[PDB]
Design a protein around this ligand. Sequence first.
Ligand SMILES: *P(=O)(O)OCC(C)(C)[C@@H](O)C(=O)NCCC(=O)NCCS
Length: 1598
Amino acid sequence: MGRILFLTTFMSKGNKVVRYLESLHHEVVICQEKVHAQSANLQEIDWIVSYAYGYILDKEIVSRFRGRIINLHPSLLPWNKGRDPVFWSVWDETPKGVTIHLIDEHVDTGDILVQEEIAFADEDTLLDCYNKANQAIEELFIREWENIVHGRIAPYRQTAGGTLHFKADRDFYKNLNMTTVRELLALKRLCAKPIDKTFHQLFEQQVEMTPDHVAVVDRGQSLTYKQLNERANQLAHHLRGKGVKPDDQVAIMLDKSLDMIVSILAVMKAGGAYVPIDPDYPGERIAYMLADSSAAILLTNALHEEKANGACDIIDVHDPDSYSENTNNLPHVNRPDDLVYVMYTSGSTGLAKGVMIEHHNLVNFCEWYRPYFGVTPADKALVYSSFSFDGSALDIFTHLLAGAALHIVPSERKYDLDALNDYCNQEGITISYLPTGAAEQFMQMDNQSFRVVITGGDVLKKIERNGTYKLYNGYGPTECTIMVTMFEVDKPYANIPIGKPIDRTRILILDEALALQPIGVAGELFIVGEGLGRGYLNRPELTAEKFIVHPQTGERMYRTGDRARFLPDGNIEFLGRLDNLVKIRGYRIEPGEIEPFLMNHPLIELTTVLAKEQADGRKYLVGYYVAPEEIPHGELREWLGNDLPDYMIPTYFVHMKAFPLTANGKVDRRALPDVLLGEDYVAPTDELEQQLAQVWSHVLGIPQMGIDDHFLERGGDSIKVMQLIHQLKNIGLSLRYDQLFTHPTIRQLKRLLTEQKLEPLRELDEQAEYETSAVEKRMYIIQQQDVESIAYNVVYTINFPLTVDTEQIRVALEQLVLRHEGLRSTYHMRGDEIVKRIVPRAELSFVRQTGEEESVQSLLAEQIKPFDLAKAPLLRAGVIETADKKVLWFDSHHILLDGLSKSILARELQALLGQQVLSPVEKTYKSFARWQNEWFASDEYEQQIAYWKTLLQGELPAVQLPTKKRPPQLTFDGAIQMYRVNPEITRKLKATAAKHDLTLYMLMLTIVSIWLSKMNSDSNQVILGTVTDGRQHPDTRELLGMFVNTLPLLLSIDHEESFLHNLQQVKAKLLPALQNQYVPFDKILEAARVKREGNRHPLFDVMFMMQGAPETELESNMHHINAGISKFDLTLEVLERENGLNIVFEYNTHLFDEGMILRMVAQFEHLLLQAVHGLDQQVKRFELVTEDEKRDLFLRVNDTAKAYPNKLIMSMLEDWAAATPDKTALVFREQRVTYRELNERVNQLAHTLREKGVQPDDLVMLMAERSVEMMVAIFAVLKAGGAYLPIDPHSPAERIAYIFADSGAKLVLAQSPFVEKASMAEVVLDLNSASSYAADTSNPPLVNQPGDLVYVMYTKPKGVMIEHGALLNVLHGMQDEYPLLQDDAFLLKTTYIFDISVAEIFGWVPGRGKLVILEPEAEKNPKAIWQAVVGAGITHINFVPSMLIPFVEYLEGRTEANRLRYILACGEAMPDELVPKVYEVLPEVKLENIYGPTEATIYASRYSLAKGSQESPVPIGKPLPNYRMYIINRHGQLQPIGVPGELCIAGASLARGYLNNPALTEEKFTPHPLEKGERIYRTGDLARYREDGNIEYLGRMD
Ligand SMILES: *P(=O)(O)OCC(C)(C)[C@@H](O)C(=O)NCCC(=O)NCCS
């Protein structure tokens, strides 16, 4: 009975087998972790039985246990060896069974001991099969174990054959194991000839089949196939004679006509592809297509010739010399992979993209179209669609190859469908493609000619039609040629499916991971096959992103962005777009976020606002609302206009009695009804306004710009304003950057430009060395000042799947090396000139490492090493391969790769990784460097630097942040915390900025400015740096290099004005800066009389960077790796990522603790949320501290609630003389008064007072210097009922008369000499004389309450009224922290015209301790005070930094003070040195720093100073029991940790106020909302909390 090692997948697997072995008394060891030769689970083992073990055993282990190592493999070996055996046995449909075998050297190949067949039912899921096989093999082992142990079985070698599978082979099928075996194999079937001819080859082939058949009809005129072919051949010979070659583009700008079809075919036959340009398009679209398309030839009319503005070499289709005599077919020069046409996508996501479609793409469609629709020459097709839409390639090309006749739609009849149907019935139009919009509308017509009406492009919903024609619903974007699927609408559907794939077309429904979705499961519609176009014109990055090579399958597929599912019958259901978001008039917004604003309308009950796209793709918003009666259109537009920008205002509003609902109660959005320029849209009037309207549409990628539309409300960024200025100078108009914002409409711009009064970047000739740009010089300077610094290393990481070939990544980067001079640029110092050298070729470091996900970052950090700017390439890369990922990392230098350069690098790396080619870089950085160097000598520069001189000449504001002690020199060690604005808030921000003619940058800038303002004591002027793109010359947009310029922003936050007003002022202050942005930061420093000095950065310590969303997917998946670097104190880098804002707080680790950034991070969020919701609120009303910070601040600082006895201080004196009469209570030199002796003396003096009308609040006055008489006077003034008002006998008489007159005191107790000094005293009971002492010694009745005054302390001085209970709170507070027990004693050092004496004078009676009345002679004398400490064994002593300094000067050499417990310093800020110096002079003693204003009853905060701790700023500490302390700014709101503010005390210990000075009392004791309406005392003292909560005194607010 031997031990047995059970190796299985998880612990409970094969547990039946384990239990059986144990019943045979086999000790079994279950192990799922990887076992090695040296594993402790191997010795004393007789058998090893593995069972789907997740690892392979070392060949040492297998040989050691020869004949004694069995594996339970759930497959009919040799079939399905290795991983996922059951699944592959089902997918590959290989023989099924379970096999117990001898593990041998290879994977699942040894001699079988016991094998058994198994069967899976069609209805079983792949999990069921997996389970059934696992159960069958376990039972098999249980039955034949005995035969195996005893060796009765004869092992037999596996049959020859089988299969093998690894972990990754199933990734493509991961989502399928919950499908039935039937369903699985059904998907297997669902996912299981070449094209030789070009179109004109087939057309010419068709011309020879039906030459005299009508080919094209245009009103009265018409051409036959022969005539069309010949006329096109004539133009083709002329076009080919003009240089047209394969893949060349020939623009065609004509109306639908015969010349149109002739020109189209003429371009093909010539060899090239025709770029169609509908002349009805606006000039903006018409100039764009001519420029973007590489077309030199423009086939056009004289009617439309001027619409090209001489941009193209025109070949007039009416000039007879444009047609050759030769009418024959030209020699074929085209392959099926050559371009046939270039269509431009919609202008929704911006400017259209040239879709490059190859011949085989069109031929495959036409070769499928003809037989699918049974097209014959008898058919007559309508040339209905604008020639620019591929819907017209359908119209023209599919029907020409079928011999059908084309019928140009009359311009008049195109949109008057009544006349269209008439024409269709007249001419007999049998087949045609109509866009869904026009199709549904045409169904209403009484058509009788059509047999097949194909539709698509938009969601078809209507099936009913007054015609006998088969309605066909087709789908497929322009990228995959007209349509990739076709459905025969045989019946109505809630979702009319788009059909099955067309010829040579496979369609995969894939999830985000590109893995197969089970049939019926929705996913992204991926198109594979012959329809896939070549890609986008001049957009290789977009081609690589949309035309992907599947990682598992290897097939090239197109990513449609559409959601669809396969229905059980094979047809595909179109489920709209994947993205919840939609781009409306230039903004990606969530239409459901407009719903609350509509529903907020009084008349509106429900609302469900969807996004609908016009026929031409223009997206508009429809706001459906359930209201009793229809609401006036203009009333809703104005309603939303009060809160939303134009683009969030639905173009149309639809009233409905109620919404259609789904089975789940949701609004059935599909069941909502369907429905232009917009109100206040003024079309251009003058020829100038038209030009201005064209440049606008181009810059903003949005058409139809009204002359009152605001630029920043139509998607205008600052980058786009630059494009406008650049493209206006091209148009001949000179516009200034700030002029665009002051004239943000074309009406305003037309008046601005009444002159109409070029300058490309001059590429330099080759030199050994070139000028560097100003910023190139700066980057170089920075790096050479710390050659070992990785501070400007630009490190990024991309997580690639294991399927990626690392060598492809390596090779792509090397191309980027050979493509951009920046990556071959080396910077050198030739004398005093920073100089760049261009290397022709550079070798890229590309390292490969294998590790684990746990060590990727560690392996990468070691790779981030400094760059030698004299060595190219300034870029390193590598791949860290883990079990899951191949992590691509690359590191570049900032002198080469700024944010935009990186976008260009990501852009182009994506193209190369996606097997695309890049156009050669037209310009070089060095050319811009020289241009800008010469521009620095122009008048424009002198005017720009003049702005900076005038702006930065005066005193500049400084922005102090709640940081740690600055390093003596600038450090760059840092870390990042990232705050995520969610997409919802981010759209709210963009909507706010657009609503009020602002950019998102201005908005975020004003939020950061307010944030910095609030953290800078709500300063009016804030200064912070920002980064401009620094791409001054428009010819530098595409160059890798350091362009970005740093700008200082002098912004003025007016906290009394609203947030918007602040936005306009910041805008007003920013635009001049951005107008003069091209002065190098270093030259702005010169003009500002500022130089790089010290531990602070020159003009600003906070950088605010902002870069828009990534331009490409690869850039999106690029993870900026911060190598522990912070270029400034703090950098807020708002990054548009995943429709939100990744606000990365890059901070100096020496200036901020992770907790200090976590708080500032939380504060910024809280503030950003307060701005977005407080557009019209005064900025002063925005809170900086978060509610969680207030709670923790209370918990850590103000959780001081400790119930205390309300029994009065003299009642407490009474009890002690009654319980322990004879104990020592006072000690003045030889006097050692007891509790009974003191109390009675007090009772005598008390009666005297009551006999002279001393009610509560009555103010008695004292001027008796340190003597028992003082205690008698106090303790008994208190007993009498009135308050004691101390006065100094040594003060001038003008003040004693002032204090007495202003106090209105009723009587005066003064030590015998000081009665004459109390001149003209109303009723003067000589303190010392016995006459002032009644013989009665009975404890008078305590009529005083805790609310009546106990003493009046004077500060023209002011008298602080403080009530009794306020004092008890303190005395019990100090007693808890610093108990003055019977053994203890208190020294009296501080003069009693100071709130500190009150502690001495009463801080002894709580614990029945004694009070040493130190003599006035020994007041400032520390040696004399030193005697008391040793003499009477003082335990409590109050002190001040001024007296505790000399007291310390008598150092350890003086000893004999064992009883001394506490030293309580107060009144002044304690120096740092005064703490440790004390400790060496007096160990075993507790030192305490105390703070308390006279208005807060003696004390307020305390800080215990540990012996083993040294404080840099000795804090005044946390508040006492029932004390609450608040640090507020000049607007009355709580400050966060570190931020200076006015210290305020609250609680039961606040002084009643100033005596008969109410204007002053209400000034300083203000009912604050932070104390639940109760008043706070404003101290006039600047302070700031610490991380732990201890308050730090900063000084009076002066
Ligand atoms: P506008 O108010 O929309 O924005 C102004 C702007 C300074 C942000 C803009 O003109 C600009 O230059 N953005 C470029 C930001 C950048 O280049 N970041 C690079 C970081 S290395």
